[PDB]
Design a protein around this nucleic acid. Structure first.
Ligand SMILES: [Mg+2]
Ligand SMILES: [Mg+2]
Ligand SMILES: [Zn+2]
Lengths: 99, 268, 1362, 79, 49, 50, 49
DNA sequence: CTCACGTATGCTATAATGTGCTGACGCGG
DNA sequence: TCCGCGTCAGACTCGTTTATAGCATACGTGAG
RNA sequence: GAGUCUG
């Protein structure tokens, strides 16, 4: 099984799992740590952002790769925006403090 | 260590006075005249009755406590519209009210999507009929067999049994399901290519042809107008607009035959 | 948007209102017919937004033209549908509702704040009982509970002027009325007057809470909810399945519960209902909200449809499955694929076979891109249809894209970093991934169906990080050790072995060749065997003093297969490398040597060549396995019948009376264990040689070329242990308990196993297989705890300029030095300039890397001890210096600044455990454990050196030792330590201190089974407290009657004997107590659990005699199963059940008080006048005697040392070295090589925090716990400026707590205990500035390490300006 | 190089900085269309930057110096 | 299954870790050729439209 | 037909497969003798003997 | 587990005292379980269900 | 501008008035 | 007594069974 | 959610 781009999950916006759902391979904690041990910071961010949740990022980077730019332009992973909403639903004020 | 909301409440109800016939009449006359204590005592004394009906009304929609509270609302309406002048007992009249309010609540709250009682009542008759059919027909009721027995439309019976199907929990099933309202990057990228090509296509055809064609479909303009509505801009014509719209499209059809689409992008 | 930090704080009712875009009044979801959102329902479009993009509900406004146009008719904003994922609502609660998280979550904030027990609060909340909020009349004070009837009494008598209420209104009032300031001062006043030890903690904790509450600006009333927020619809979606049915989140069921009960409460309030009913509704409302927030915490969770509890808000965040672990610290990924792996022996080391169809799909955008630049595709949809049609031109384009583009291969489980590697792909027809053999080791890849993930690095940056950092070729050495991972195996080994190994004469013995080319010509011509012992002329190239290679040529006896291998061997290497018969062990050394001399590209080429030649000659040989291979010894049946009549004689002696079950078990196991070794050694002599080959004339002996023997000797597959079971005797099998079956299997596989032997086998087998499934998870949980603790640790500085460091000495554990000083200090920064013996000329500087060249010099001079710079002693704040660390073991040079060291450390500790779990378990059947260690024989002549020893001379003439810690050493002439030998207690020494012994002399004998209790004094033996049935037991014999006494411990003992310690007391002939030479102690030896005394009371003993024998049953397996819990216990800094005691201050000590037997050791120092007085157990016996001038941290007690007490008294290097050695003991027992520096990283992370005494210029005061780096920073500015000086004391934290003590709550939450972490952060108003790695990975940003360290340090300087 | 990047690490030193510098140069050729100093030889922008670093033509300092130069020439043209 | 002429011996790494080297003759003789029958359904439903 | 790796036997300690292989060849040995006698027709008496 | 009686014992476990606490468990096919057990102080206890 | 359609709140009267599945994990703080 | 922890991907299947009165006026929006 | 599985 192989996948470049496909459908994406409902809440988390991450790609689905399994070959029947045309799914992306799970990049697990273990696999992340490996990139952490190495240097590989761009490979990791890619895997976190334009390859998974980052909605704007993934489309923008697709366009760049057909345009042959091979530039990332990262964003904010959508699972996080949900996390925030789920913690505010608990009645905890969790704000982003700006620069 | 009594912590449970239910056991606490049932402890409190047991702690009440039980009413007699003459007592019910005395309190009921004072109650309708508008006594505070009389209303309180009649309600509190008859809470036990709510519980007996609510206890046999569980495992159908809401919880016992939820079924007892809604049942209590029926008790209040019962005390308000009780007639002590009629020799007939209160328990008999109250039972109607308690069952009515519990049933009504169970028909509304239980389903996530608000369902009308009109359809629910119809459904009841269809299901009771199915039961009698099942006892004699060793098999189960068909839609047509139920419809035959009630002398009603097959389509109407099917619509009703179609609303019987309950909802399923996503929590998992969530991960199998994928966003259908959100298009994929590949699809969104394809729309970007088309929208960008149009701008370049507008400055490739004639100046009056790409003006009239674009502002009609709402490509360059703000509002998607029709052949007759293109007259508002500067065209102010009906025949000349229709000849020029199609003249723009005919020259563009040859631009797609030469670039390498036409029948190639016809499948799409 | 781009932000600095994140803060968390309690939500105000009004704050909650801010986020809300309306109050959802109704439970209505959607209309059954028009499946659109209902009025002011849960999916209301008027509140959360439009269902369709830029379209109102009633449909009046459409298209992107209408922007923010709120439709007047339906009341729906024309914006994108996206908004319905972001907009929140709210619910107006009739009754105030307590927030379960602040109530139930321990310790609890509402309870701790009110100083009111939880029970009291709950009685109030469920409306069982009233609570007093305030009474001016002290009659009833504050927070005093009144029952229904208690409320009636005061209400008539006082009433009115006293306020007492019920439910959450009461608690909210109580919280509103409480003044944080005033209570802070009152509690400070209490601590000043009478600070009781344990309640000082609790008072200080409520003080910290009150202070932190006021600093956070959180209000206690807000713990009670008046407004209840509503989650946006799309985050609790109602979607139609294909079947026409709908599917929804359980949050919808919980919100509908809450709304129904809340609205019913509004109704019953409008109707003025009697209060019993109001109360029930308020209980039900609190139940519904508590279910909605956190279901299952408030008791029985609300079961929905199946019976399963509804998933609540907190359940979506909390669990491993929450959102942290599942959707945030790891994710599903685009441009990712998998398939089965298979060999690619043809590949070079930097390549991998990637299926055509798989690669077509992964590089889809890259194809689209080139297709449009060539003008072959007019647009993207036409390019997609050309790929769909899989046109011939598309393959050519795809070949062009993949060129020089690296792909990541990953295998589960990813234990260490080499579980991901980058390769350049090679397009292949067929559906399987082709993996290079030499990297199979790092992946632990075996091709019996394993699969791999493929991932495509998209950006130029990611491509470069893959090619430079993650490439196969570039990750040759293990980062856990200095040994390489890429090493030829199987055929690659068998073939090179076949080539190098020599045979007698064969074809063309003793010929002469002109170089390896005449040799290869001869072999391939068929005039020479590869084992033709002939001399060839090979030209070696040795490196001189300068870079130049010096030419050298000479003749040397060898074979015809080794000369031909020389052709593969790169110039620079000696010919002696190929001149031995090569195995896997020798080839690994060969590739490491080549890497360190020649460098990376040469070793890469050389590795490929070795693989190619390996299989090339592997197929040329053609070795197989027959039934004649395993040759069982002629003398098996003799050895067995001998062993068998012997065990029979001991079973007959069992009914007689010299034997317990334990004694005979040991004796039978010993007999069979020695028989098995004998039969095995018979088989291996008979098989290993027993080659009669006639040399050129007469007969000779040489090594056997029997197939199985070659397989074993080469190290290709089976070991001698497996071949014992094939050809020798199968041996003693061990039950799933670990206890060994008394009847061994006499037969082998060749002979045939029966149903009984096979059935007995099964036990061990299945326990092994169950072990792999079940045990794998504690290993992995340890990796994860380690990783979390040492995530932040990054190389920050190049040189801190520190002199400080740990003294490393050769690790000579047992008899032979498994790992010397060179291996232990190999690649380590040297500090405090350490020269040679003669102190008159510096040999090594104080800022240099310990390279193999330096290391070789160290060995000529025989330097034993070297202070080296370590991670633990590094001064760098918020990371560690390249010099303190030393070499990146994976690179073979000094570590690069920015490398994430902690992660590598945790992974490298974690991996072996997790791998040795699955590995040794499926692979072994029986338990080949040895236990011959019962008598020291010395290997080399020398003089006996006994350090730490106190022994008594027995009537034999012999030195019987009675010390616990005893270290016999073997000194030579010059006076160096070379052999060590742990003498036990109860030992007979042959010779006493400093006496000469020759090679192969026995110097001490002791029994391994039984640790005897050996008496110092001579006299008569008295039975103290040894009441039969109470404390001991009596067991009698026949004819005359020998009774034997067994000391029942408190386990079997009656209530009556519990307080009695049973002990054999030494009295003299008079029946007075005999003293222990020179002290006031009377002789008395306290007998432990099951101390089996033979000789009954009143027997004249001589000194040095065995009184009592304590059964020392050692029925434990020699696996990681038993080792890993020891490792986890050290890392988590657990005090044992019997930790040793050490002096706190230097100075002179005498004894004071005693509690019956319990010692109250009084230290009264010389200069420091204050005493230090300790309570000590009675039975714990002291090493020190009385008045000695002992320094800080002198060992007083026996048994195991607590790492806490080591750190606290001796210090950092002491405790670090204790952990390193005690952990390494376990891993070394399993043959696992991990560098100390990794363990040292994690210990540094353990010693992160420190407690403070006194104040400085900041807010320290008594006993705040602050991180060490931050207090050092304060101390640096303080010492320059002055102000109040602050005494500090470093604290040890074991892993789990250390990770939770990190000053990032995003890391704390993601680890564990998320509910508790977020309540404590919310209450403190804590602000996470996102400094660590986990924090950055969560927000999906650049890691502060590796590639990101450049960018990250640029942002930190952008903080200074702009 | 083609096979292994050891030589290019030996020029700059820090593997991490090697990657940044090769990235920056590859981006120039990818976007700006900067001409390669070594013959392309059908090599991707990733490998060409590593060749240029190996031979010691490309470097963080050198790239910065030429950035200033082109940027001051553009300032000159604007004024 | 099917019995086969098997030889125990290395090949050029084509039997590395349990990897199996098979003759073309096995494929020709259609031995270990296997038959699989997949079931696909198409459902005509009734919708609100 | 198939070439399997010798090194996946002595570690695995499934010696059954080797005995199966020796006997399998012996079984097929006798099948090859019967095949040879059937190709040359020969006697029912002789086949019966063997 | 077949219904009937079973006599079992925590082999240590509870109380570092290391006392073997004996227990009986009566298991029916249908009904509440009847437990008897010892306490460290040798008092016989009953746990119904 | 008017009626039909969808949805809801109403009232009826023998007396009846007190509840209620799966159980057993193991180590630490 | 209570509550905080327990390896990493992959394959497939099943599942969301059951219950309740009848007819009059009132409340409210939509369609022609 | 309960399965039968491959490392
Ligand atoms: Mg495997
Ligand atoms: Mg094995
Ligand atoms: Zn509208």
């Amino acid at each position: 099984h192989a996948r470049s781009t496909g459908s994406y999950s409902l809440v988390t916006q991450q790609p689905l799992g399994g070959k029947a759902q045309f799914g992306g391979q799970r990049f697990g904690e273990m696999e992340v740590w490996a990139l952490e041990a190495y240097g590989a910071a761009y490979t990791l961010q890619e895997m976190l952002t334009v390859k998974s949740d980052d909605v704007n990022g993934r489309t923008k980077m697709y366009k760049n790769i057909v345009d042959g730019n091979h530039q990332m332009e990262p964003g904010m992973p959508e699972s996080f925006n949900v996390l925030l909403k789920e913690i505010r639903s608990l009645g905890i004020n969790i704000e982003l403090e700006d620069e | 260590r009594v912590l449970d909301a239910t056991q606490l409440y049932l402890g409190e109800i047991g702690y009440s006075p039980l009413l007699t016939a003459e007592e019910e009449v005395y309190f009921a006359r004072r109650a309708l005249r508008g006594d505070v204590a009389s209303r309180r005592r009649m309600i509190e004394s008859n809470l036990r009755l709510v519980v007996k009906i609510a206890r046999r009304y569980g495992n159908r929609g809401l919880a016992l406590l939820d079924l007892i509270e809604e049942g209590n609302l029926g008790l209040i309406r019962a005390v308000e519209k009780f007639d002590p002048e009629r020799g007939f007992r209160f328990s008999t009249y109250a039972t109607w009210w308690i069952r009515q309010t519990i049933e009504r609540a169970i028909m509304n709250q239980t389903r996530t999507i608000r369902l009308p009682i009109h359809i629910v009542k119809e459904l009841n008759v269809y299901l009771r009929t199915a039961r009698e059919l099942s006892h004699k027909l060793d098999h189960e009721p068909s839609a047509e067999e139920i419809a035959e027995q009630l002398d009603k439309p097959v389509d109407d019976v099917s619509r009703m049994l179609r609303l019987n199907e309950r909802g399923t929990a996503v929590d998992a099933l969530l991960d199998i399901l994928a966003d259908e309202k959100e298009n994929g990057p590949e699809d969104t990228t394809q729309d970007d290519d088309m929208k960008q090509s149009i701008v370049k296509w507008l400055f490739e055809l004639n100046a009056k042809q790409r003006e009239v064609l674009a502002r009609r479909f709402g490509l360059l303009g703000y509002e998607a107008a029709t052949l007759e509505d293109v007259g508002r801009e500067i065209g102010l014509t009906r025949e000349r607009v229709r000849q020029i719209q199609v003249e723009g499209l005919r020259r563009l059809r040859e631009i797609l035959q030469t670039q390498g689409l036409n029948i190639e992008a016809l499948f799409l | 948007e781009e932000f600095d930090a994140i803060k968390i704080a309690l939500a105000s009712p009004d704050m909650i209102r801010s986020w809300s875009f309306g109050e959802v009044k109704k439970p209505e979801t959607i209309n059954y017919r028009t499946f659109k959102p209902e009025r002011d329902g849960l999916f209301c479009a008027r509140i959360f937004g439009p269902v369709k993009d830029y379209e109102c509900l009633c449909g009046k406004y459409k298209r992107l033209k209408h922007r923010g146009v709120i439709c007047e008719k339906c009341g729906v904003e024309v914006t994108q549908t996206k908004v319905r994922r972001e907009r929140m609502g709210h619910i107006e609660l009739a009754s105030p509702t307590a927030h379960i998280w602040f109530l139930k979550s321990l310790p609890s904030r509402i309870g701790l704040l009110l100083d009111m027990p939880l029970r009291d609060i709950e009685r109030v909340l469920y409306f069982e009982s009233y609570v007093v909020i305030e009474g001016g009349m002290t009659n009833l004070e504050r927070q005093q509970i009144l029952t229904e009837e208690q409320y009636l009494d005061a209400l008539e008598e006082f009433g009115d002027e006293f306020d007492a209420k019920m439910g959450a209104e009461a608690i909210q009032a109580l919280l509103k009325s409480m003044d944080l300031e005033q209570e802070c001062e009152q509690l400070r006043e209490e601590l000043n007057e009478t600070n009781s030890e344990t309640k000082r903690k609790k008072l200080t904790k409520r003080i910290k809470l009150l202070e932190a509450f006021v600093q956070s600006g959180n209000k206690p009333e807000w713990m009670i909810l008046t407004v209840l927020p509503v989650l946006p619809p799309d985050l609790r979606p109602l979607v139609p399945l294909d079947g026409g049915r709908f599917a929804t989140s359980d949050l919808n069921d919980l919100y509908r519960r809450v709304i129904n009960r809340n609205n019913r409460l509004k109704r019953l309030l409008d109707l003025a209902a009697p209060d019993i009913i109001v109360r029930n509704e308020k209980r039900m409302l609190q139940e519904a909200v508590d279910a909605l927030l956190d279901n299952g915490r408030r008791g029985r969770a609300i079961t929905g449809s199946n019976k399963r509890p509804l998933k609540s808000l907190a359940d979506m965040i909390k669990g491993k499955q929450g959102r942290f672990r599942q959707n945030l610290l790891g994710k599903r990924v685009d441009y990712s694929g998998r398939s089965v792996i298979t060999v690619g022996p043809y590949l070079r080391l930097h390549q991998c076979g990637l299926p055509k169809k798989m690669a077509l799909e992964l590089f889809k955008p890259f194809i689209y891109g080139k297709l449009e630049l060539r003008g072959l595709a007019t647009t993207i949809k036409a390019a997609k249809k050309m790929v769909e049609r899989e046109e011939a031109v598309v393959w050519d384009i795809l070949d062009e894209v993949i060129r020089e583009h690296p792909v990541l291969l990953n295998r589960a489980p990813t234990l260490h970093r080499l579980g991901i590697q980058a390769f350049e792909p090679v397009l292949i027809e067929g559906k399987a991934i082709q993996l290079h053999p030499l990297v199979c080791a790092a992946y632990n890849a075996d091709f019996d169906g394993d699969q791999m993930a493929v991932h495509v690095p998209l950006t130029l940056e990611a491509q470069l990080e893959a090619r430079a950092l993650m490439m196969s070729t570039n990750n040759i050495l293990s980062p856990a050790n200095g040994e390489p991972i890429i090493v030829p195996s199987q055929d690659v080994v068998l073939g090179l072995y076949y080539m190098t190994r020599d045979c007698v004469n064969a074809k063309g013995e003793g010929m002469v060749l002109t170089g390896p080319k005449e040799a290869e010509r001869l072999y391939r011509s068929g005039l020479a065997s590869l084992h033709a012992r002939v001399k060839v002329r090979i030209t070696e190239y040795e490196k001189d003093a300068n870079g130049e290679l010096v030419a050298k040529t000479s003749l040397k006896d060898t074979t015809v297969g080794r000369a031909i291998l020389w052709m593969i061997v790169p110039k620079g290497l000696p010919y002696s490398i190929v001149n031995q018969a090569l195995g896997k062990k020798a080839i690994s050394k060969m590739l490491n040597t080549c890497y360190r001399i020649l460098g990376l590209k040469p070793t890469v080429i050389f590795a490929d060549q070795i693989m190619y030649t390996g299989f090339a000659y592997a197929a040329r040989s053609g070795a197989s396995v027959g039934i004649d291979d395993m040759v069982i010894p002629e003398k098996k049946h003799e050895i067995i019948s001998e062993a068998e009549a012997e065990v029979a004689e001991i079973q007959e002696q069992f009914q007689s009376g010299l034997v317990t079950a334990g004694e005979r078990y040991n004796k039978v196991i010993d007999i069979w264990a020695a028989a098995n070794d004998r039969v095995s050694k018979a088989m291996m002599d008979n098989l290993q040689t027993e080659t009669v080959i006639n040399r050129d004339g007469q007969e000779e002996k040489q090594v056997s070329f029997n197939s199985i023997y070659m397989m074993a000797d080469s190290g290709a597959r089976g070991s001698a242990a497996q071949i014992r079971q094939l050809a020798g005797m199968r041996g003693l099998m061990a039950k799933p308990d670990g206890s060994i079956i008394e009847t061994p299997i006499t037969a082998n596989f060749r002979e045939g196993l029966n149903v009984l032997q096979y059935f007995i086998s099964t036990h061990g087998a299945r326990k092994g297989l169950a072990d792999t499934a079940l045990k794998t998870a504690n290993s992995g949980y340890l990796t994860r705890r380690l990783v979390d603790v040492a995530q932040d640790l990054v190389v920050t500085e190049d040189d801190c300029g520190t002199h400080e460091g740990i003294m490393m000495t050769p690790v000579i554990e047992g008899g032979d030095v498994k790992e010397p000083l060179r291996d232990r200090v190999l690649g380590r920064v040297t500090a405090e300039d350490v020269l040679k013996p003669g102190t008159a000329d510096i040999l090594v500087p104080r800022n240099t890397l310990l390279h193999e060249q330096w290391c070789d010099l160290l060995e000529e001079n025989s330097v034993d001890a070297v202070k080296v710079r370590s991670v633990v002693s590094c001064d760098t704040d918020f990371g560690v210096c390249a010099h303190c660390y030393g070499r990146d073991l994976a690179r073979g040079h000094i570590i690069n600044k920015g490398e994430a060291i902690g992660v590598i450390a945790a992974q490298s500790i974690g991996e072996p455990g997790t791998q040795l779990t699955m590995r040794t378990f499926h692979i072994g059947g029986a338990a080949s454990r040895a236990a011959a260690e019962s008598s020291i024989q010395v290997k080399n002549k020398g003089s006996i050196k006994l350090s730490n020893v106190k022994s008594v001379v027995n009537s034999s003439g012999k030195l019987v030792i009675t010390s616990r810690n005893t270290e016999l050493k073997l000194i030579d002439e010059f006076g160096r330590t070379k052999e060590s030998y742990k003498v036990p207690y109860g030992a007979v020494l042959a010779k006493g201190d400093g006496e000469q012994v020759a090679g192969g002399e026995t110097v001490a004998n002791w029994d391994p089974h039984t640790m005897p209790v050996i008496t110092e004094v001579s006299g008569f033996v008295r039975f103290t407290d040894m009441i039969d049935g109470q404390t001991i037991t009596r067991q009698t014999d026949e004819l005359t009657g020998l009774s034997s006494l067994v000391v029942l411990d408190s386990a079997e003992r009656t209530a009556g004997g519990k307080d009695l310690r049973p002990a054999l007391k030494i009295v003299d002939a008079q029946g007075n107590d005999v003293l222990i030479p020179g002290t006031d102690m009377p002789a008395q030896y306290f007998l432990p659990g099951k101390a089996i005394v033979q000789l009954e009371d009143g027997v004249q003993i001589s000194s040095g005699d065995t009184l009592a024998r304590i059964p020392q049953e050692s029925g434990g397996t020699k696996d990681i199963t038993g080792g890993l819990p020891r490792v986890a216990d050290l890392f988590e800094a657990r005090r044992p059940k019997e930790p040793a005691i050490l002096a706190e201050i230097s100075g002179i000590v005498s004894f004071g008080k005693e509690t019956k037997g319990k010692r109250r050791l009084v230290i009264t120092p010389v200069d420091g006048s204050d005493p230090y007085e300790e309570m000590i157990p009675k039975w714990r016996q002291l090493n020190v005697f009385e008045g000695e001038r002992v320094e800080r941290g002198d060992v007083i007690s026996d048994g195991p040392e607590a790492p806490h007490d080591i750190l606290r008294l001796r210090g950092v290097h002491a405790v670090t070295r204790y952990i390193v050695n005690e952990v390494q003991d376990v891993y070394r027992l399993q043959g696992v090589k991990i560098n100390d520096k990794h363990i040292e990283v994690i210990v540094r992370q353990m010693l992160r925090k420190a407690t403070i005494v006194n104040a400085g210029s900041s807010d320290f005061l008594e006993g705040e716990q602050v991180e060490y780096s931050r207090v050092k920073i304060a101390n640096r500015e303080l010492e320059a400026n002055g102000k109040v000086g602050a005494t500090y004391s470093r604290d040890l934290l074991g892993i789990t707590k250390a990770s939770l003590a990190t000053e990032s709550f995003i890391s704390a939450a993601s680890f564990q205990e998320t509910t508790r972490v977020l309540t404590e952060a919310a209450v403190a108003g804590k602000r996470d500035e996102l400094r660590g790695l986990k924090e950055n990975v969560i927000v999906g940003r650049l890691i502060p390490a590796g590639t990101g360290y450049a960018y990250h340090q640029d942002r930190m300087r952008r903080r200074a300006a702009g | 190089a083609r096979v292994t990047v050891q030589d290019a690490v030996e020029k700059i030193g820090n593997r991490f900085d090697l990657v940044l510098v090769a990235a920056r140069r590859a981006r120039q050729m990818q976007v700006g269309g900067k001409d390669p100093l070594v013959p392309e030889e059908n090599d991707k922008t990733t490998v060409i930057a590593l060749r240029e670093i190996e031979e010691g033509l490309i470097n963080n300092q050198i790239l910065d110096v030429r950035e200033r130069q082109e940027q001051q020439e553009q300032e000159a043209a604007e004024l | 299954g099917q019995n086969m002429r098997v030889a125990f011996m290395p090949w050029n790494g084509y039997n590395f870790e349990d990897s199996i080297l098979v003759s073309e003759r096995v494929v020709q003789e259609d031995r270990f050729t296997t038959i699989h029958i997949q079931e696909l359904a198409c459902v005509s439903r009734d919708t609100k439209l | 037909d198939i070439v399997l790796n010798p090194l996946g036997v002595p570690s695995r300690m499934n010696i059954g497969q080797i005995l199966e292989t020796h006997l399998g060849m012996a079984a097929k040995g006798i099948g090859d003798k019967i095949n040879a006698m059937l190709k040359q027709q020969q006697e029912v008496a002789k086949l019966r003997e063997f | 587990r077949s219904p009937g009686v079973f006599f079992d014992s925590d082999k240590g476990k509870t109380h570092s005292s290391g006392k073997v606490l004996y227990n009986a468990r009566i298991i029916p096919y249908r009904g509440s379980w009847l437990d008897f057990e010892f306490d460290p102080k040798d008092n016989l206890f009953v746990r119904i269900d």
